[PDB]
Amino acid sequence: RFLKVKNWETDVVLTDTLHLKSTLETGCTEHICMGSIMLPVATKDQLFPLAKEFLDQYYSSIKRFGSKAHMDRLEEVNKEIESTSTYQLKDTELIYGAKHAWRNASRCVGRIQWSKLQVFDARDCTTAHGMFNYICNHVKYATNKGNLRSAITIFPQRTDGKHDFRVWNSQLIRYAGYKQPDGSTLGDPANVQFTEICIQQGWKAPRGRFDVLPLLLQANGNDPELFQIPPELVLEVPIRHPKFDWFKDLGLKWYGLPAVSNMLLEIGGLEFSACPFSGWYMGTEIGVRDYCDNSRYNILEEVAKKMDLDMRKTSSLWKDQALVEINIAVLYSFQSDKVTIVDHHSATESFIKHMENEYRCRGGCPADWVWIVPPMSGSITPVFHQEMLNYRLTPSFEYQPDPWNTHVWKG
Amino acid sequence: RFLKVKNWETDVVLTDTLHLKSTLETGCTEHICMGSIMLPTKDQLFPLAKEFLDQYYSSIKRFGSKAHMDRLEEVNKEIESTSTYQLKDTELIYGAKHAWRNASRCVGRIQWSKLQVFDARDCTTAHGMFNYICNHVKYATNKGNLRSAITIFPQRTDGKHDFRVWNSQLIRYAGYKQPDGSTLGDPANVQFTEICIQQGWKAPRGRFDVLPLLLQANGNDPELFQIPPELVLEVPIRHPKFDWFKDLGLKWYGLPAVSNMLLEIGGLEFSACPFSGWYMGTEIGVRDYCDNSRYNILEEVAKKMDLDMRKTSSLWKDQALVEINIAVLYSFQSDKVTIVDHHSATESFIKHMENEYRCRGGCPADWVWIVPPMSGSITPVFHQEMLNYRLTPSFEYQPDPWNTHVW
Ligand code: HEM
Ligand code: HEM
Ligand SMILES: Cc1cc(N)nc(C[C@@H]2CNC[C@@H]2NCCNCCc2cccc(F)c2)c1
Ligand SMILES: Cc1cc(N)nc(C[C@@H]2CNC[C@@H]2NCCNCCc2cccc(F)c2)c1
Numbered sequence A: 001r002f003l004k005v006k007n008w009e010t011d012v013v014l015t016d017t018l019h020l021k022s023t024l025e026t027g028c029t030e031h032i033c034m035g036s037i038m039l040p041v042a043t044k045d046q047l048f049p050l051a052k053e054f055l056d057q058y059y060s061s062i063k064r065f066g067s068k069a070h071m072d073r074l075e076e077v078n079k080e081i082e083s084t085s086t087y088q089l090k091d092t093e094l095i096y097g098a099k100h101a102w103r104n105a106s107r108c109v110g111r112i113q114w115s116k117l118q119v120f121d122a123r124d125c126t127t128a129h130g131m132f133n134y135i136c137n138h139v140k141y142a143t144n145k146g147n148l149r150s151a152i153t154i155f156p157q158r159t160d161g162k163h164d165f166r167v168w169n170s171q172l173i174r175y176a177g178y179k180q181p182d183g184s185t186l187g188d189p190a191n192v193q194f195t196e197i198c199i200q201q202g203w204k205a206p207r208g209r210f211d212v213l214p215l216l217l218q219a220n221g222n223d224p225e226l227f228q229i230p231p232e233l234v235l236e237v238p239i240r241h242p243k244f245d246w247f248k249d250l251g252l253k254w255y256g257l258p259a260v261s262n263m264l265l266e267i268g269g270l271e272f273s274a275c276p277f278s279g280w281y282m283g284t285e286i287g288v289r290d291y292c293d294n295s296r297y298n299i300l301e302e303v304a305k306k307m308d309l310d311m312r313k314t315s316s317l318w319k320d321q322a323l324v325e326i327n328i329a330v331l332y333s334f335q336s337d338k339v340t341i342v343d344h345h346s347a348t349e350s351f352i353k354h355m356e357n358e359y360r361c362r363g364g365c366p367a368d369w370v371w372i373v374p375p376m377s378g379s380i381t382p383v384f385h386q387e388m389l390n391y392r393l394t395p396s397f398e399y400q401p402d403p404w405n406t407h408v409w410k411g
Numbered sequence B: 001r002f003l004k005v006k007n008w009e010t011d012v013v014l015t016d017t018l019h020l021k022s023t024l025e026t027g028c029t030e031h032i033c034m035g036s037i038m039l040p041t042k043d044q045l046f047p048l049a050k051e052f053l054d055q056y057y058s059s060i061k062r063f064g065s066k067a068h069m070d071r072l073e074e075v076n077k078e079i080e081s082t083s084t085y086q087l088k089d090t091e092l093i094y095g096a097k098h099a100w101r102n103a104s105r106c107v108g109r110i111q112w113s114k115l116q117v118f119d120a121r122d123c124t125t126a127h128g129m130f131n132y133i134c135n136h137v138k139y140a141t142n143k144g145n146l147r148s149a150i151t152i153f154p155q156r157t158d159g160k161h162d163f164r165v166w167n168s169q170l171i172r173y174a175g176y177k178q179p180d181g182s183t184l185g186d187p188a189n190v191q192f193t194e195i196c197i198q199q200g201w202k203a204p205r206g207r208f209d210v211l212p213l214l215l216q217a218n219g220n221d222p223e224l225f226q227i228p229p230e231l232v233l234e235v236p237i238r239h240p241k242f243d244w245f246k247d248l249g250l251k252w253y254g255l256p257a258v259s260n261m262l263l264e265i266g267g268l269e270f271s272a273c274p275f276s277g278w279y280m281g282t283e284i285g286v287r288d289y290c291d292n293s294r295y296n297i298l299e300e301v302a303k304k305m306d307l308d309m310r311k312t313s314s315l316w317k318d319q320a321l322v323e324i325n326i327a328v329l330y331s332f333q334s335d336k337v338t339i340v341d342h343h344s345a346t347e348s349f350i351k352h353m354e355n356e357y358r359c360r361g362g363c364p365a366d367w368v369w370i371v372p373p374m375s376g377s378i379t380p381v382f383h384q385e386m387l388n389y390r391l392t393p394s395f396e397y398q399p400d401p402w403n404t405h406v407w
């Protein structure tokens, strides 16, 4: 079976065969498409086949499929599963696995970079304090004084599911949110609930608009513990506009390191429930989503007021006007401070090249159009006109529910 | 069975039950999602007819009544004896309004029940098709106070007697390949424009040349017709602040009128069914003007605005884009020609979805198409989960006839 995808701007047609290697379900059926739905303990029985598929992939990629090394490794994993109901990855398999989970991440526009990924093996970690230290080192390494470097830190795998390592923060660096009694919110409304948990756990809240949250870390299924990231490690950028001098007076800033900490990395059947990873920002993540979502900092009106736009009718496109200026400001501010950032035009152009390379070398590239197309100026980016096929490959990153919903409190 | 859709901005959760009444295949499977692919007998006909008549009689609260059963027998008999059947006028109007209501890619469906239907099933020639189409254009345009309309020509028979409009829309601009290699006018219509000349259209060879109609009646070779210019309402494009904008020499037509789709009602196939409503501003300002394979005017507008065109990160493309779209909306509004902006259209669609969930049990919607091609996440549709599924009656895309036909 072959499937074709077309670019409607260029007429370049591509052929997908990689999707034949897919096993997991998308959420779609022959009768319903779920492409815009955000969210559409294992047995030996299921485990050895998952390990095998993975190691066959790995040995093919080093071009030792069917080698003595390959066969000895399968036998050795089989024996470890038999004896212990699980197994441990070699360092090389871990590195390969984490890189491929990124390569396979269909919602990620940044995947041209997939093979340059610094992997930090934290599988010897045992306590929350140890987690905190590994996470500090990740942040310092990744930040690299503004010359951002991609990285991931991988804590011990799931065992019985009663002993999970988790980072309770959804990203390593995020700002507190405080719901006021009048119903307004100070800071980031997305973090209100997490901020409340932090506070209950003992965090002393500065109660400002941009307070960096503490880390909340759970080792070995234990109750999570609070740590403050040293401020000298948190790189931040004050937001100003190249032409509008009143922009700085809005008091906006943002952190330089986007570092997703709430996902589950699955490799050869093993589940890494704490695997924080980081890259660098595409500008629209901050300037469109974080600043301009109604449910977030919501600065559109205030910026439009200062621009003296006609705010009486939507058809003045005052929201669209303010939006571009804010995104100009974010790119200008990061660039002037020499902090790595990518605009949506450049990032999408690179993804198209990545995607075409992947069809040629790999036989495909799973991609989720709904997520890949930027949240402003969609159709003036090349990805808008690119047909894409979405399917699920492993190794993979997966969403997990927030731990406060699942955690058994020990006290 | 029951499926939920969440709005991530408002937290509102809706339950879909309408999808269980779905019949056609989406293109997706459990292993692969094809949500972004643009194109993913007597025995066959009676269940189709029955499925349709059951829903029709249910809608007028006469399900299982004598009139219902009688009609189902009359349609059975007609199929058994003729190999097809004929819709009552009431059924035709119901079917058309519902094909629009079921159109998952259409953001403007809040309007679905206000559709003027022109029954052209008595038409026999291309000259007659031209008359029907002229009347549709004049009725729909209404001197700028646009009204939604569809004109329905005779249904498919044995297949070699199809009625077809060859144009993809009733009103579009010519495209010509030029001596230097570049393109004059609309590059999307270069192929169609050459066929017009091939069949003998004397092309004025300008930028905004309204194309002639090419009409295929009863399976015959198509014929050329120029729409009376006085029936084609056009809008000169100016900017409310930029004096220089008028000087780019831009105009667009007021009436968007899709003419290449197939209407399917109760298993009957209406291959020529041009319909029209009114524009959302981004269709013109983002897609027609700014697509690279289209009029591609971003480069020139950014120049007039003396923006920094050195780096993509200056967002010069984005700044120009907004101003262009301000201009489209301004020109239409100043000339009293119906238009809707993307903010207003998407707000209305959310309101429609919620009406449809509560009144019908769902609303099929294709997020990829409903989200505007600019400013996506500042419109409410961006944050709205949608379920896409295929209900009949429906509109379906059909391939260009100049591949199918033999002269
Ligand atoms: C190197 C710079 C990178 C850029 C510019 C980039 C860009 C993006 C963007 C724009 C998204 C959509 C995210 C959103 O809108 O919330 C995304 C999603 C995602 N990225 Fe990348 N990314 C980068 C690096 C990485 C790395 C290093 C990994 C892991 C090794 C990764 C894995 C993922 C995953 C798993 C998602 C889906 C997130 C979710 O479901 O919430 N990305 N990326
Ligand atoms: C009254 C105002 C209307 C508005 C604002 C509107 C808006 C839109 C928009 C923005 C699209 C996306 C298609 C594109 O971007 O090319 C669309 C598609 C569509 N519309 Fe509506 N529409 C209106 C009336 C109608 C009517 C009267 C019908 C049929 C009776 C209709 C049926 C469809 C269909 C079948 C599509 C998908 C087209 C395709 O596959 O190329 N629309 N509409
Ligand atoms: C419900 C749900 C499901 C899901 N899969 N996900 C979410 C997080 C949402 C996705 N969209 C906004 C928020 N995500 C927040 C930040 N995502 C940054 C991705 C990124 C960028 C650059 C470098 C990197 F390493 C990583 C929620
Ligand atoms: C390949 C293919 C498939 C398909 N289904 N379709 C197409 C036409 C493309 C889609 N999108 C841009 C262009 N269609 C151009 C304009 N479509 C107008 C929709 C509309 C608006 C207001 C009132 C109406 F009555 C109708 C191509």
Ligand SMILES: C[C@H](O)[C@H](O)[C@H]1CNc2nc(N)[nH]c(=O)c2N1
Pocket: A035, A036, A037, A038, A370, A371, A372, B008, B382, B383, B384, B385, B386
């Ligand atoms: C409902 C819809 O799927 C949801 O709003 C999605 C749309 N596209 C997205 N795309 C990205 N990159 N990030 C997101 O959070 C979303 N949200």
Ligand SMILES: C[C@H](O)[C@H](O)[C@H]1CNc2nc(N)[nH]c(=O)c2N1
Pocket: A008, A384, A385, A386, A387, A388, B035, B036, B037, B038, B368, B369, B370
């Ligand atoms: C490849 C992709 O499906 C294609 O470019 C789509 C994207 N969304 C669209 N949305 C609308 N309304 N109209 C279109 O023509 C398209 N084109």
Ligand SMILES: [Zn+2]
Pocket: A028, A032, A033, A034, A035, B028, B032, B033, B034, B035
């Ligand atoms: Zn799908």
